[PDB]
């Protein structure tokens, strides 16, 4: 058995910059390492095998080096099409994939556009009530969303979903939903979602009042 320790799990790279991924094997694998690119909804693609040998057609900005137990993979002059997840593979004794590295494209900061929505009349006929907050076109992905109900933070009952990084401007979008019972919803008047982000010192706050 050969274990493979790939680092890091996630990376941000600037356009035209240089990326490095390392991979360490638990035993000597005699340069029998390969690197794969994987994009959502597609089959992986072999880039390099035997440590440094590019497959025909693969761009020269990919490279690999190493020996013994220690290996690395590099992308220079990084282009947008290189944003993907990357995996190393040893094949000296059986096969073992490393855990994977997710790349994202580093861009200029952007503050989110925030929108909040009350439960619909249709959902309130069912005894459940969802309040929804959209946070669109922000960067970085690292954002803190808090729900406040009549001034008090509500942490439980919230589900969040992030889109992938946008292929046209490299920002993110996010949806946050607070699902309550209908009577819980009807007990309070003020509903707020607030986002804390690098792009502002004070939170971006959006509220509504149920009776208004």
């Amino acid at each position: 058995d050969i274990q493979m320790t790939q680092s890091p799990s996630s990376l941000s790279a600037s356009l035209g910059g240089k990326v490095t991924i390392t991979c360490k094997a638990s035993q000597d694998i005699k340069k029998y390492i390969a690197w794969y690119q994987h994009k959502p909804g597609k089959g992986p693609r072999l880039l390099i095998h035997y440590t440094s040998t590019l497959q025909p057609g693969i761009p020269s900005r990919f490279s690999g080096s190493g020996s013994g137990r220690d290996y690395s993979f590099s992308i220079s002059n990084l282009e947008p099409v290189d944003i993907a997840t990357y995996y190393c593979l040893q094949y000296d004794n059986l096969l073992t994939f490393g855990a994977g590295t997710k790349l994202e494209l580093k861009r200029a900061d952007a503050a989110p556009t925030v929108s909040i929505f009350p439960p619909s009349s249709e959902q309130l006929t069912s005894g459940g009530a969802s309040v929804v907050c959209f946070l669109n076109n922000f960067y970085p992905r690292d954002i803190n969303v808090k729900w406040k109900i009549d001034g008090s933070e509500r942490q439980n009952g919230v589900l969040n979903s992030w889109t992938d990084q946008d292929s046209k401007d490299s920002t993110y979008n996010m949806s946050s939903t607070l699902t309550l019972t209908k009577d819980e919803y009807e007990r309070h008047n003020s509903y707020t979602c607030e986002a804390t982000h690098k792009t502002s010192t004070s939170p971006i706050v959006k509220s509504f009042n149920r009776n208004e």
Binding site: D1, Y32, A34, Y36, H38, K42, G43, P44, R45, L46, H49, Q55, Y87, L89, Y91, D92, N93, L94, L95, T96, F97, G98, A99, G100, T113, S115, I116, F117, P118, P119, S120, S121, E122, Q123, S126, S130, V132, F134, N136, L159, N160, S161, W162, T163, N173, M174, S175, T177, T179, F208, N209, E212
Partner: protein, 219 residues
């Protein structure tokens, strides 16, 4: 012109078994080995095993002993992997991949299939409820709709039957009460809505659901 053809997604109950297929074309089937690889939702790739089609020799990941069984059918240039006694831990995308030419016992893969998604679940096909998201009260106005409580994936959402495409965001579904929920948003000029009709069109093929939900100011 190497082609590895795999079925689209499958849904089975816990305790079942499946036999996945991989139809190869564009090369001499018996001159290249075949690999199988597992990928759980949100996790990495995990090798299962490889088989030599010329003589059905195999070697495998020991974690899959008694779970995965690899075979081939030379006359049809197809490779198979049987997965037995399925649990929710077996829900994953399963890929086949051709091995680089080699006479070694172990070797790296070159061309991959697109993968078969296998979901192991006792949940039942359930149509979504579709809820409009209208704001409280600005030059761009954002609207949306909430597609709540459906199974299985996928759902599609369009706006004004496709006439509105710029500034449309549909979010990945999340699990809530062991059903899926998703939302979609569209941003239009405030001179457009509510002056003009904005409608979200939701389709859930597995339940034959088609709902057109007009967005109007909240009562």
């Amino acid at each position: 012109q190497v082609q590895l053809q795999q079925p689209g997604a499958e849904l089975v109950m816990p305790g079942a078994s499946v036999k996945l297929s991989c139809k190869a074309s564009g090369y001499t089937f018996t001159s290249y080995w075949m690999h199988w690889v597992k990928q759980r939702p949100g996790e990495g790739l995990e090798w299962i095993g490889e088989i030599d089609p010329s003589d059905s020799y195999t070697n495998d990941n020991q974690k899959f002993k008694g779970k995965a069984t690899l075979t081939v059918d030379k006359s049809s240039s197809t490779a198979y992997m049987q997965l037995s006694s399925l649990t929710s831990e077996d829900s994953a995308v399963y890929y086949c991949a051709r091995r680089l030419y080699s006479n070694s016992y172990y070797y790296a893969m070159d061309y991959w299939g697109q993968g078969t998604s296998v979901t192991v679940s006792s949940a039942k096909t359930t149509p979504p409820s579709v809820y409009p998201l209208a704001p409280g009260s600005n030059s761009m106005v954002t609207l949306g709709c909430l597609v709540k409580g459906y199974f299985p994936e996928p759902v599609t959402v369009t706006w004004n039957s496709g006439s509105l495409s710029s500034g449309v965001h549909t979010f990945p579904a999340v699990l809530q009460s062991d059903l899926y929920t998703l939302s979609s948003s569209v941003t239009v000029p405030s001179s457009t809505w509510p002056s003009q009709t904005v409608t979200c069109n939701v389709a859930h093929p597995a339940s034959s659901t088609k709902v057109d939900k007009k967005i109007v100011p909240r009562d």
